[PDB]
Amino acid sequence: QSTVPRLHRPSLQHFREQFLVPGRPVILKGVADHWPCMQKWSLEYIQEIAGCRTVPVEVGSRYTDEEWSQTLMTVNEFISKYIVNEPRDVGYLAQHQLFDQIPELKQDISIPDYCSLGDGEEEEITINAWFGPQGTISPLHQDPQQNFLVQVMGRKYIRLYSPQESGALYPHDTHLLHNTSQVDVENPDLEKFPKFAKAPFLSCILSPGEILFIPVKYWHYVRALDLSFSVSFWWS
Ligand SMILES: COc1ccccc1CNc1cnc(C(=O)O)cc1C(=O)O
Ligand SMILES: [Mn+2]
């Protein structure tokens, strides 16, 4: 097979031994599925609690041959321009510490208990919101910390490549992009990147209530299948 395993509420020792230490991805069930965000966060709730706040928005075109420009707008404007009406471009309220900006929302989540297995402080855990329409796509990339990616709204297709396959992923030569792959995962140029086709991977569709553990430096690729809202915990 090649799917990420799903475990229900495993023990801290079981998670530590079989996944954190060796660096193996896993989906945790029955952990975040009773967080209040799982029943409260609708577009209506998000507009009520956050609608008038300014948020950074990444905007790019469906044509992949562009950069994402970074702008500012109110959550109300974001929802109106990029979620409800057919938009020319895709907009993504991505990698934002919304819960520091709006503590009222921090009541609706928690920090997974498994984070305490790390060697860092809880006051150093980065919490980011990923709120966007169907069709947002990350590059294939790796991050310098452990990650819990919690799906709240919608589904996301995720592809994972171990740091050991890095050679077949053709990272960019620039220093600023050495953590990012040059390959388009879902339509690769196998004439320019032939080693990509035989690089093994894990994949999953992450659904609401589920938590994907992305080991530090594990390459991950993310595409939103629906109107989606995710919360990531970056920790060490
Ligand atoms: C700011 O970055 C952008 C900008 C535009 C499009 C995609 C991305 C990155 N997309 C992710 C990266 N990393 C994670 C993770 O959990 O580490 C999650 C996502 C996710 O889109 O859900
Ligand atoms: Mn990432």
Side-chain angles (χ1 to χ4, degrees), residues 64 136-142 157-162 165 168-172 179-190 193 195-204 218-223:
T64 62
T136 63
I137 302 172
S138 81
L140 178 67
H141 70 290
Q142 59 184 175
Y157 175 68
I158 298 170
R159 287 264 287 274
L160 305 165
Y161 291 83
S162 167
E165 304 301 331
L169 307 182
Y170 301 88
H172 284 264
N179 70 321
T180 296
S181 169
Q182 296 172 68
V183 178
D184 179 347
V185 168
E186 285 192 90
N187 193 6
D189 183 353
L190 292 179
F193 311 121
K195 297 187 278 185
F196 180 79
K198 300 297 172 63
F201 59 83
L202 300 174
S203 71
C204 61
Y218 223 99
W219 296 91
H220 50 288
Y221 165 88
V222 179
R223 166 160 70 92

mmCIF file of all heavy atoms in Angstrom, residues 64 136-142 157-162 165 168-172 179-190 193 195-204 218-223:
data_model
loop_
_atom_site.group_PDB
_atom_site.id
_atom_site.type_symbol
_atom_site.label_atom_id
_atom_site.label_comp_id
_atom_site.label_asym_id
_atom_site.label_seq_id
_atom_site.Cartn_x
_atom_site.Cartn_y
_atom_site.Cartn_z
ATOM 1 N N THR A 64 -0.352 28.139 -13.247
ATOM 2 C CA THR A 64 0.674 27.909 -12.239
ATOM 3 C C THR A 64 1.910 28.768 -12.478
ATOM 4 O O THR A 64 2.672 28.997 -11.533
ATOM 5 C CB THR A 64 1.050 26.415 -12.190
ATOM 6 O OG1 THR A 64 1.590 25.981 -13.446
ATOM 7 C CG2 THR A 64 -0.179 25.584 -11.853
ATOM 8 N N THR A 136 -6.611 25.544 -3.650
ATOM 9 C CA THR A 136 -5.313 26.045 -3.231
ATOM 10 C C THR A 136 -4.311 24.907 -3.289
ATOM 11 O O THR A 136 -4.623 23.758 -2.964
ATOM 12 C CB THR A 136 -5.380 26.639 -1.824
ATOM 13 O OG1 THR A 136 -5.739 25.611 -0.894
ATOM 14 C CG2 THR A 136 -6.416 27.772 -1.745
ATOM 15 N N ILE A 137 -3.106 25.218 -3.737
ATOM 16 C CA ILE A 137 -2.063 24.212 -3.854
ATOM 17 C C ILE A 137 -0.744 24.752 -3.335
ATOM 18 O O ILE A 137 -0.274 25.787 -3.805
ATOM 19 C CB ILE A 137 -1.893 23.781 -5.315
ATOM 20 C CG1 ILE A 137 -3.207 23.250 -5.865
ATOM 21 C CG2 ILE A 137 -0.774 22.747 -5.384
ATOM 22 C CD1 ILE A 137 -3.140 22.982 -7.448
ATOM 23 N N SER A 138 -0.141 24.056 -2.406
ATOM 24 C CA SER A 138 1.229 24.360 -2.013
ATOM 25 C C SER A 138 2.232 23.736 -2.986
ATOM 26 O O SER A 138 1.940 22.741 -3.643
ATOM 27 C CB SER A 138 1.518 23.784 -0.646
ATOM 28 O OG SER A 138 1.812 22.407 -0.874
ATOM 29 N N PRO A 139 3.421 24.289 -3.105
ATOM 30 C CA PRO A 139 4.512 23.517 -3.697
ATOM 31 C C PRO A 139 4.850 22.340 -2.789
ATOM 32 O O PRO A 139 4.472 22.283 -1.614
ATOM 33 C CB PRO A 139 5.656 24.536 -3.809
ATOM 34 C CG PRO A 139 5.282 25.658 -2.910
ATOM 35 C CD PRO A 139 3.869 25.526 -2.461
ATOM 36 N N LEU A 140 5.523 21.355 -3.360
ATOM 37 C CA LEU A 140 6.116 20.322 -2.528
ATOM 38 C C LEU A 140 7.280 20.941 -1.766
ATOM 39 O O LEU A 140 8.176 21.558 -2.354
ATOM 40 C CB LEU A 140 6.551 19.149 -3.397
ATOM 41 C CG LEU A 140 7.233 17.976 -2.707
ATOM 42 C CD1 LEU A 140 6.396 17.226 -1.821
ATOM 43 C CD2 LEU A 140 7.850 17.027 -3.840
ATOM 44 N N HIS A 141 7.258 20.804 -0.451
ATOM 45 C CA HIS A 141 8.253 21.488 0.359
ATOM 46 C C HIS A 141 8.381 20.775 1.697
ATOM 47 O O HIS A 141 7.557 19.938 2.071
ATOM 48 C CB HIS A 141 7.892 22.964 0.581
ATOM 49 C CG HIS A 141 6.714 23.143 1.478
ATOM 50 N ND1 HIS A 141 5.437 22.800 1.097
ATOM 51 C CD2 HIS A 141 6.622 23.581 2.754
ATOM 52 C CE1 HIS A 141 4.606 23.020 2.098
ATOM 53 N NE2 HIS A 141 5.303 23.487 3.117
ATOM 54 N N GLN A 142 9.418 21.160 2.434
ATOM 55 C CA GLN A 142 9.708 20.614 3.750
ATOM 56 C C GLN A 142 9.902 21.766 4.731
ATOM 57 O O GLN A 142 10.362 22.836 4.333
ATOM 58 C CB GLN A 142 10.952 19.727 3.679
ATOM 59 C CG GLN A 142 12.181 20.449 3.185
ATOM 60 C CD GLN A 142 13.416 19.552 3.005
ATOM 61 O OE1 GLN A 142 14.443 20.008 2.517
ATOM 62 N NE2 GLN A 142 13.330 18.293 3.414
ATOM 63 N N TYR A 157 -6.128 16.900 -0.190
ATOM 64 C CA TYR A 157 -5.280 15.844 -0.718
ATOM 65 C C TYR A 157 -3.828 16.192 -0.414
ATOM 66 O O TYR A 157 -3.356 17.278 -0.770
ATOM 67 C CB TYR A 157 -5.508 15.696 -2.220
ATOM 68 C CG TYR A 157 -4.589 14.718 -2.892
ATOM 69 C CD1 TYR A 157 -4.675 13.360 -2.640
ATOM 70 C CD2 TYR A 157 -3.634 15.151 -3.795
ATOM 71 C CE1 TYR A 157 -3.831 12.463 -3.279
ATOM 72 C CE2 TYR A 157 -2.786 14.258 -4.432
ATOM 73 C CZ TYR A 157 -2.894 12.920 -4.174
ATOM 74 O OH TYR A 157 -2.054 12.035 -4.799
ATOM 75 N N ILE A 158 -3.120 15.276 0.242
ATOM 76 C CA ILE A 158 -1.753 15.524 0.688
ATOM 77 C C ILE A 158 -0.844 14.409 0.205
ATOM 78 O O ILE A 158 -1.177 13.231 0.350
ATOM 79 C CB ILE A 158 -1.687 15.632 2.219
ATOM 80 C CG1 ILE A 158 -2.534 16.821 2.668
ATOM 81 C CG2 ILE A 158 -0.281 15.782 2.685
ATOM 82 C CD1 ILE A 158 -2.759 16.906 4.197
ATOM 83 N N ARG A 159 0.320 14.774 -0.328
ATOM 84 C CA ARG A 159 1.319 13.814 -0.773
ATOM 85 C C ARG A 159 2.583 14.047 0.029
ATOM 86 O O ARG A 159 3.007 15.194 0.171
ATOM 87 C CB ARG A 159 1.632 13.966 -2.264
ATOM 88 C CG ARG A 159 0.552 13.470 -3.171
ATOM 89 C CD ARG A 159 0.782 12.034 -3.652
ATOM 90 N NE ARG A 159 1.853 11.951 -4.633
ATOM 91 C CZ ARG A 159 1.680 12.145 -5.933
ATOM 92 N NH1 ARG A 159 0.476 12.446 -6.398
ATOM 93 N NH2 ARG A 159 2.707 12.063 -6.762
ATOM 94 N N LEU A 160 3.205 12.965 0.514
ATOM 95 C CA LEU A 160 4.353 13.036 1.419
ATOM 96 C C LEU A 160 5.534 12.274 0.833
ATOM 97 O O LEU A 160 5.381 11.142 0.368
ATOM 98 C CB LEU A 160 3.995 12.463 2.793
ATOM 99 C CG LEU A 160 2.767 13.105 3.441
ATOM 100 C CD1 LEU A 160 2.222 12.255 4.623
ATOM 101 C CD2 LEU A 160 3.077 14.477 3.915
ATOM 102 N N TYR A 161 6.704 12.891 0.848
ATOM 103 C CA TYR A 161 7.924 12.225 0.429
ATOM 104 C C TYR A 161 8.957 12.341 1.539
ATOM 105 O O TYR A 161 9.193 13.438 2.052
ATOM 106 C CB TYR A 161 8.461 12.842 -0.862
ATOM 107 C CG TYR A 161 7.647 12.598 -2.104
ATOM 108 C CD1 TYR A 161 6.568 13.394 -2.389
ATOM 109 C CD2 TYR A 161 8.015 11.617 -3.020
ATOM 110 C CE1 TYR A 161 5.851 13.219 -3.545
ATOM 111 C CE2 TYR A 161 7.302 11.407 -4.161
ATOM 112 C CZ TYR A 161 6.202 12.208 -4.438
ATOM 113 O OH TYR A 161 5.446 12.014 -5.594
ATOM 114 N N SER A 162 9.563 11.212 1.908
ATOM 115 C CA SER A 162 10.542 11.195 2.983
ATOM 116 C C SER A 162 11.736 12.077 2.630
ATOM 117 O O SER A 162 12.024 12.298 1.450
ATOM 118 C CB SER A 162 11.021 9.767 3.232
ATOM 119 O OG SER A 162 12.176 9.739 4.048
ATOM 120 N N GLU A 165 14.245 10.760 -0.037
ATOM 121 C CA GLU A 165 14.001 10.845 -1.467
ATOM 122 C C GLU A 165 14.338 12.233 -2.013
ATOM 123 O O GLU A 165 13.974 12.545 -3.148
ATOM 124 C CB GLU A 165 12.538 10.484 -1.763
ATOM 125 C CG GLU A 165 12.108 9.114 -1.246
ATOM 126 C CD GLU A 165 12.940 7.989 -1.837
ATOM 127 O OE1 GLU A 165 13.424 8.159 -2.988
ATOM 128 O OE2 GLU A 165 13.130 6.960 -1.139
ATOM 129 N N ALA A 168 15.395 12.922 -5.654
ATOM 130 C CA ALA A 168 14.466 12.770 -6.752
ATOM 131 C C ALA A 168 13.465 13.905 -6.820
ATOM 132 O O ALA A 168 12.710 13.969 -7.790
ATOM 133 C CB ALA A 168 13.734 11.432 -6.645
ATOM 134 N N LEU A 169 13.471 14.821 -5.859
ATOM 135 C CA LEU A 169 12.522 15.919 -5.827
ATOM 136 C C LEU A 169 13.069 17.218 -6.396
ATOM 137 O O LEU A 169 12.319 18.199 -6.453
ATOM 138 C CB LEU A 169 12.075 16.159 -4.390
ATOM 139 C CG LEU A 169 11.559 14.913 -3.683
ATOM 140 C CD1 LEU A 169 11.073 15.239 -2.248
ATOM 141 C CD2 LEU A 169 10.437 14.289 -4.524
ATOM 142 N N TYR A 170 14.365 17.265 -6.739
ATOM 143 C CA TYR A 170 14.979 18.376 -7.441
ATOM 144 C C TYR A 170 14.663 19.686 -6.730
ATOM 145 O O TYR A 170 14.035 20.552 -7.310
ATOM 146 C CB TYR A 170 14.504 18.449 -8.876
ATOM 147 C CG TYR A 170 14.776 17.211 -9.698
ATOM 148 C CD1 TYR A 170 13.881 16.158 -9.727
ATOM 149 C CD2 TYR A 170 15.939 17.097 -10.455
ATOM 150 C CE1 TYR A 170 14.144 15.014 -10.494
ATOM 151 C CE2 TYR A 170 16.214 15.966 -11.185
ATOM 152 C CZ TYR A 170 15.326 14.915 -11.210
ATOM 153 O OH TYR A 170 15.615 13.780 -11.964
ATOM 154 N N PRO A 171 15.166 19.867 -5.506
ATOM 155 C CA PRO A 171 15.031 21.167 -4.834
ATOM 156 C C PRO A 171 15.639 22.290 -5.664
ATOM 157 O O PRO A 171 16.564 22.073 -6.448
ATOM 158 C CB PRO A 171 15.794 21.000 -3.521
ATOM 159 C CG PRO A 171 15.947 19.486 -3.310
ATOM 160 C CD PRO A 171 15.976 18.892 -4.746
ATOM 161 N N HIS A 172 15.146 23.506 -5.441
ATOM 162 C CA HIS A 172 15.691 24.672 -6.115
ATOM 163 C C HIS A 172 17.112 24.935 -5.652
ATOM 164 O O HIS A 172 17.498 24.600 -4.530
ATOM 165 C CB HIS A 172 14.834 25.894 -5.847
ATOM 166 C CG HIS A 172 13.557 25.925 -6.624
ATOM 167 N ND1 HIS A 172 13.419 26.613 -7.810
ATOM 168 C CD2 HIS A 172 12.349 25.371 -6.368
ATOM 169 C CE1 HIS A 172 12.178 26.487 -8.249
ATOM 170 N NE2 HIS A 172 11.505 25.747 -7.385
ATOM 171 N N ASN A 179 14.378 24.549 0.271
ATOM 172 C CA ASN A 179 13.401 23.680 0.912
ATOM 173 C C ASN A 179 12.217 23.350 0.018
ATOM 174 O O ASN A 179 11.269 22.698 0.463
ATOM 175 C CB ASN A 179 12.868 24.345 2.177
ATOM 176 C CG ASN A 179 11.968 25.556 1.865
ATOM 177 O OD1 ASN A 179 12.252 26.334 0.942
ATOM 178 N ND2 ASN A 179 10.876 25.712 2.632
ATOM 179 N N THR A 180 12.222 23.795 -1.220
ATOM 180 C CA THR A 180 11.075 23.639 -2.098
ATOM 181 C C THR A 180 11.482 22.851 -3.329
ATOM 182 O O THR A 180 12.582 23.037 -3.858
ATOM 183 C CB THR A 180 10.522 25.006 -2.519
ATOM 184 O OG1 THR A 180 10.022 25.696 -1.364
ATOM 185 C CG2 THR A 180 9.427 24.850 -3.610
ATOM 186 N N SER A 181 10.579 21.996 -3.796
ATOM 187 C CA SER A 181 10.827 21.173 -4.969
ATOM 188 C C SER A 181 10.500 21.952 -6.234
ATOM 189 O O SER A 181 9.628 22.822 -6.258
ATOM 190 C CB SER A 181 9.991 19.890 -4.892
ATOM 191 O OG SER A 181 9.958 19.112 -6.087
ATOM 192 N N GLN A 182 11.226 21.645 -7.290
ATOM 193 C CA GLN A 182 10.935 22.236 -8.583
ATOM 194 C C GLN A 182 9.816 21.510 -9.319
ATOM 195 O O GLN A 182 9.396 21.954 -10.394
ATOM 196 C CB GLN A 182 12.189 22.207 -9.457
ATOM 197 C CG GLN A 182 13.331 23.009 -8.972
ATOM 198 C CD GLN A 182 14.602 22.771 -9.813
ATOM 199 O OE1 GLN A 182 14.680 23.150 -10.985
ATOM 200 N NE2 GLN A 182 15.587 22.119 -9.215
ATOM 201 N N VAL A 183 9.386 20.377 -8.834
ATOM 202 C CA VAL A 183 8.476 19.513 -9.578
ATOM 203 C C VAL A 183 7.030 19.870 -9.253
ATOM 204 O O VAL A 183 6.693 20.142 -8.100
ATOM 205 C CB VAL A 183 8.768 18.035 -9.247
ATOM 206 C CG1 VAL A 183 7.782 17.073 -9.978
ATOM 207 C CG2 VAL A 183 10.216 17.697 -9.554
ATOM 208 N N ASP A 184 6.176 19.880 -10.277
ATOM 209 C CA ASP A 184 4.729 19.938 -10.084
ATOM 210 C C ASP A 184 4.225 18.528 -9.796
ATOM 211 O O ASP A 184 4.189 17.680 -10.691
ATOM 212 C CB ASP A 184 4.060 20.524 -11.324
ATOM 213 C CG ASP A 184 2.540 20.590 -11.207
ATOM 214 O OD1 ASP A 184 1.951 19.968 -10.275
ATOM 215 O OD2 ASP A 184 1.945 21.280 -12.069
ATOM 216 N N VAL A 185 3.820 18.271 -8.554
ATOM 217 C CA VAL A 185 3.616 16.886 -8.127
ATOM 218 C C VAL A 185 2.564 16.198 -8.981
ATOM 219 O O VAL A 185 2.700 15.025 -9.344
ATOM 220 C CB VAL A 185 3.218 16.848 -6.643
ATOM 221 C CG1 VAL A 185 2.715 15.466 -6.263
ATOM 222 C CG2 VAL A 185 4.359 17.242 -5.759
ATOM 223 N N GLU A 186 1.498 16.902 -9.312
ATOM 224 C CA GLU A 186 0.373 16.246 -9.960
ATOM 225 C C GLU A 186 0.424 16.286 -11.485
ATOM 226 O O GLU A 186 -0.524 15.823 -12.136
ATOM 227 C CB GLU A 186 -0.923 16.870 -9.450
ATOM 228 C CG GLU A 186 -1.250 16.414 -8.027
ATOM 229 C CD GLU A 186 -2.606 16.771 -7.625
ATOM 230 O OE1 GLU A 186 -3.480 15.931 -7.879
ATOM 231 O OE2 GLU A 186 -2.782 17.861 -7.051
ATOM 232 N N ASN A 187 1.500 16.814 -12.059
ATOM 233 C CA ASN A 187 1.701 16.811 -13.493
ATOM 234 C C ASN A 187 3.184 17.002 -13.775
ATOM 235 O O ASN A 187 3.582 18.024 -14.352
ATOM 236 C CB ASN A 187 0.872 17.902 -14.155
ATOM 237 C CG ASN A 187 0.820 17.732 -15.667
ATOM 238 O OD1 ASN A 187 1.307 16.744 -16.222
ATOM 239 N ND2 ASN A 187 0.222 18.683 -16.332
ATOM 240 N N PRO A 188 4.032 16.054 -13.375
ATOM 241 C CA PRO A 188 5.482 16.304 -13.414
ATOM 242 C C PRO A 188 6.051 16.299 -14.826
ATOM 243 O O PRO A 188 5.631 15.518 -15.680
ATOM 244 C CB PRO A 188 6.065 15.146 -12.597
ATOM 245 C CG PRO A 188 5.036 14.030 -12.736
ATOM 246 C CD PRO A 188 3.694 14.749 -12.769
ATOM 247 N N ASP A 189 7.058 17.151 -15.054
ATOM 248 C CA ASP A 189 7.838 17.136 -16.293
ATOM 249 C C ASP A 189 8.893 16.054 -16.139
ATOM 250 O O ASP A 189 9.985 16.282 -15.626
ATOM 251 C CB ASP A 189 8.454 18.503 -16.543
ATOM 252 C CG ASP A 189 9.204 18.571 -17.826
ATOM 253 O OD1 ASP A 189 9.367 17.503 -18.467
ATOM 254 O OD2 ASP A 189 9.614 19.708 -18.174
ATOM 255 N N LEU A 190 8.541 14.843 -16.542
ATOM 256 C CA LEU A 190 9.451 13.723 -16.418
ATOM 257 C C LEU A 190 10.597 13.764 -17.412
ATOM 258 O O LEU A 190 11.534 12.979 -17.260
ATOM 259 C CB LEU A 190 8.678 12.418 -16.585
ATOM 260 C CG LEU A 190 7.721 12.160 -15.417
ATOM 261 C CD1 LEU A 190 6.955 10.864 -15.618
ATOM 262 C CD2 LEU A 190 8.435 12.126 -14.087
ATOM 263 N N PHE A 193 12.635 16.166 -15.047
ATOM 264 C CA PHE A 193 12.788 15.578 -13.712
ATOM 265 C C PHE A 193 12.491 14.074 -13.712
ATOM 266 O O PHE A 193 11.579 13.595 -13.019
ATOM 267 C CB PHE A 193 11.890 16.312 -12.721
ATOM 268 C CG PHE A 193 12.011 17.784 -12.780
ATOM 269 C CD1 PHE A 193 10.903 18.567 -13.069
ATOM 270 C CD2 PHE A 193 13.221 18.384 -12.482
ATOM 271 C CE1 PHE A 193 11.016 19.932 -13.089
ATOM 272 C CE2 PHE A 193 13.357 19.742 -12.507
ATOM 273 C CZ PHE A 193 12.258 20.528 -12.816
ATOM 274 N N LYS A 195 13.835 11.385 -12.376
ATOM 275 C CA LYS A 195 13.902 10.616 -11.135
ATOM 276 C C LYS A 195 12.647 10.755 -10.285
ATOM 277 O O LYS A 195 12.448 9.945 -9.374
ATOM 278 C CB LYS A 195 15.122 11.014 -10.290
ATOM 279 C CG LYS A 195 16.468 10.723 -10.969
ATOM 280 C CD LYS A 195 17.622 10.979 -10.050
ATOM 281 C CE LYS A 195 18.017 12.437 -9.982
ATOM 282 N NZ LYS A 195 19.288 12.628 -9.105
ATOM 283 N N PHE A 196 11.779 11.727 -10.570
ATOM 284 C CA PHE A 196 10.598 11.916 -9.732
ATOM 285 C C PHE A 196 9.607 10.769 -9.869
ATOM 286 O O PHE A 196 8.922 10.423 -8.901
ATOM 287 C CB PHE A 196 9.914 13.229 -10.088
ATOM 288 C CG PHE A 196 8.694 13.514 -9.268
ATOM 289 C CD1 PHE A 196 8.811 14.008 -7.991
ATOM 290 C CD2 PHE A 196 7.421 13.288 -9.780
ATOM 291 C CE1 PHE A 196 7.691 14.281 -7.240
ATOM 292 C CE2 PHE A 196 6.266 13.550 -9.010
ATOM 293 C CZ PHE A 196 6.410 14.064 -7.751
ATOM 294 N N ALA A 197 9.542 10.149 -11.043
ATOM 295 C CA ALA A 197 8.486 9.179 -11.305
ATOM 296 C C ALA A 197 8.611 7.939 -10.430
ATOM 297 O O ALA A 197 7.598 7.337 -10.060
ATOM 298 C CB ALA A 197 8.519 8.800 -12.776
ATOM 299 N N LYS A 198 9.827 7.560 -10.056
ATOM 300 C CA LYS A 198 10.041 6.375 -9.239
ATOM 301 C C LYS A 198 10.370 6.700 -7.779
ATOM 302 O O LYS A 198 10.921 5.858 -7.069
ATOM 303 C CB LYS A 198 11.154 5.530 -9.854
ATOM 304 C CG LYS A 198 10.885 5.018 -11.291
ATOM 305 C CD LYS A 198 9.660 4.075 -11.338
ATOM 306 C CE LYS A 198 9.289 3.723 -12.771
ATOM 307 N NZ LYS A 198 10.394 2.967 -13.461
ATOM 308 N N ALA A 199 10.050 7.888 -7.319
ATOM 309 C CA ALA A 199 10.230 8.209 -5.922
ATOM 310 C C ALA A 199 9.005 7.773 -5.133
ATOM 311 O O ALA A 199 7.904 8.278 -5.390
ATOM 312 C CB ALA A 199 10.435 9.694 -5.758
ATOM 313 N N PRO A 200 9.151 6.894 -4.149
ATOM 314 C CA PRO A 200 7.982 6.424 -3.411
ATOM 315 C C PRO A 200 7.390 7.528 -2.555
ATOM 316 O O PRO A 200 8.068 8.485 -2.163
ATOM 317 C CB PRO A 200 8.543 5.284 -2.557
ATOM 318 C CG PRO A 200 9.992 5.566 -2.391
ATOM 319 C CD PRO A 200 10.404 6.294 -3.650
ATOM 320 N N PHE A 201 6.104 7.372 -2.247
ATOM 321 C CA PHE A 201 5.447 8.364 -1.418
ATOM 322 C C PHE A 201 4.280 7.765 -0.640
ATOM 323 O O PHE A 201 3.805 6.659 -0.911
ATOM 324 C CB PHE A 201 4.990 9.523 -2.288
ATOM 325 C CG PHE A 201 4.042 9.128 -3.372
ATOM 326 C CD1 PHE A 201 2.680 8.996 -3.110
ATOM 327 C CD2 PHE A 201 4.526 8.881 -4.663
ATOM 328 C CE1 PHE A 201 1.810 8.621 -4.131
ATOM 329 C CE2 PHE A 201 3.684 8.523 -5.699
ATOM 330 C CZ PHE A 201 2.318 8.395 -5.450
ATOM 331 N N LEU A 202 3.838 8.529 0.349
ATOM 332 C CA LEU A 202 2.577 8.310 1.033
ATOM 333 C C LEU A 202 1.597 9.394 0.611
ATOM 334 O O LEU A 202 2.010 10.506 0.284
ATOM 335 C CB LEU A 202 2.732 8.370 2.548
ATOM 336 C CG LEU A 202 3.691 7.343 3.132
ATOM 337 C CD1 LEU A 202 3.801 7.682 4.624
ATOM 338 C CD2 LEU A 202 3.227 5.963 2.917
ATOM 339 N N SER A 203 0.297 9.083 0.646
ATOM 340 C CA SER A 203 -0.736 10.056 0.297
ATOM 341 C C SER A 203 -1.990 9.812 1.135
ATOM 342 O O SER A 203 -2.218 8.721 1.662
ATOM 343 C CB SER A 203 -1.080 10.014 -1.210
ATOM 344 O OG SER A 203 -1.786 8.834 -1.571
ATOM 345 N N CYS A 204 -2.818 10.844 1.237
ATOM 346 C CA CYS A 204 -4.056 10.719 1.986
ATOM 347 C C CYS A 204 -4.988 11.834 1.574
ATOM 348 O O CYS A 204 -4.567 12.822 0.972
ATOM 349 C CB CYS A 204 -3.796 10.793 3.485
ATOM 350 S SG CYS A 204 -3.068 12.332 4.010
ATOM 351 N N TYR A 218 9.958 16.370 6.490
ATOM 352 C CA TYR A 218 9.239 15.534 5.534
ATOM 353 C C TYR A 218 8.642 16.422 4.441
ATOM 354 O O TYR A 218 8.014 17.440 4.744
ATOM 355 C CB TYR A 218 8.137 14.743 6.251
ATOM 356 C CG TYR A 218 8.003 13.285 5.832
ATOM 357 C CD1 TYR A 218 8.580 12.269 6.600
ATOM 358 C CD2 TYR A 218 7.291 12.934 4.674
ATOM 359 C CE1 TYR A 218 8.460 10.955 6.221
ATOM 360 C CE2 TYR A 218 7.157 11.633 4.299
ATOM 361 C CZ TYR A 218 7.748 10.659 5.071
ATOM 362 O OH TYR A 218 7.628 9.371 4.669
ATOM 363 N N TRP A 219 8.866 16.058 3.171
ATOM 364 C CA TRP A 219 8.318 16.813 2.042
ATOM 365 C C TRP A 219 6.823 16.578 1.993
ATOM 366 O O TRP A 219 6.393 15.437 2.141
ATOM 367 C CB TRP A 219 8.934 16.345 0.721
ATOM 368 C CG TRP A 219 10.409 16.610 0.643
ATOM 369 C CD1 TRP A 219 11.397 15.765 1.026
ATOM 370 C CD2 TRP A 219 11.059 17.780 0.118
ATOM 371 N NE1 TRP A 219 12.622 16.332 0.788
ATOM 372 C CE2 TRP A 219 12.445 17.572 0.232
ATOM 373 C CE3 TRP A 219 10.599 18.967 -0.466
ATOM 374 C CZ2 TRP A 219 13.384 18.534 -0.181
ATOM 375 C CZ3 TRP A 219 11.508 19.903 -0.883
ATOM 376 C CH2 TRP A 219 12.891 19.686 -0.743
ATOM 377 N N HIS A 220 6.028 17.641 1.852
ATOM 378 C CA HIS A 220 4.572 17.516 1.812
ATOM 379 C C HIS A 220 4.018 18.456 0.746
ATOM 380 O O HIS A 220 4.557 19.539 0.512
ATOM 381 C CB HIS A 220 3.864 17.807 3.199
ATOM 382 C CG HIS A 220 4.294 19.087 3.874
ATOM 383 N ND1 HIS A 220 5.532 19.240 4.466
ATOM 384 C CD2 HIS A 220 3.642 20.261 4.079
ATOM 385 C CE1 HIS A 220 5.649 20.466 4.947
ATOM 386 N NE2 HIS A 220 4.516 21.108 4.724
ATOM 387 N N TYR A 221 2.933 18.022 0.103
ATOM 388 C CA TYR A 221 2.251 18.728 -0.973
ATOM 389 C C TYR A 221 0.775 18.699 -0.625
ATOM 390 O O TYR A 221 0.258 17.640 -0.261
ATOM 391 C CB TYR A 221 2.489 18.033 -2.301
ATOM 392 C CG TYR A 221 1.561 18.458 -3.373
ATOM 393 C CD1 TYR A 221 1.863 19.547 -4.169
ATOM 394 C CD2 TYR A 221 0.380 17.763 -3.609
ATOM 395 C CE1 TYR A 221 1.011 19.941 -5.211
ATOM 396 C CE2 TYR A 221 -0.495 18.153 -4.624
ATOM 397 C CZ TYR A 221 -0.157 19.234 -5.421
ATOM 398 O OH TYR A 221 -0.976 19.652 -6.412
ATOM 399 N N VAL A 222 0.086 19.829 -0.746
ATOM 400 C CA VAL A 222 -1.255 19.969 -0.181
ATOM 401 C C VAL A 222 -2.142 20.619 -1.218
ATOM 402 O O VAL A 222 -1.799 21.687 -1.730
ATOM 403 C CB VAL A 222 -1.262 20.829 1.092
ATOM 404 C CG1 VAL A 222 -2.661 20.965 1.641
ATOM 405 C CG2 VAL A 222 -0.303 20.206 2.165
ATOM 406 N N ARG A 223 -3.301 20.022 -1.485
ATOM 407 C CA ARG A 223 -4.268 20.627 -2.396
ATOM 408 C C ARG A 223 -5.646 20.542 -1.747
ATOM 409 O O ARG A 223 -6.088 19.455 -1.365
ATOM 410 C CB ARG A 223 -4.285 19.968 -3.805
ATOM 411 C CG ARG A 223 -5.505 20.353 -4.615
ATOM 412 C CD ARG A 223 -5.351 20.143 -6.083
ATOM 413 N NE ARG A 223 -5.316 18.733 -6.431
ATOM 414 C CZ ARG A 223 -6.377 18.016 -6.756
ATOM 415 N NH1 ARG A 223 -7.580 18.558 -6.752
ATOM 416 N NH2 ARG A 223 -6.229 16.741 -7.056
#
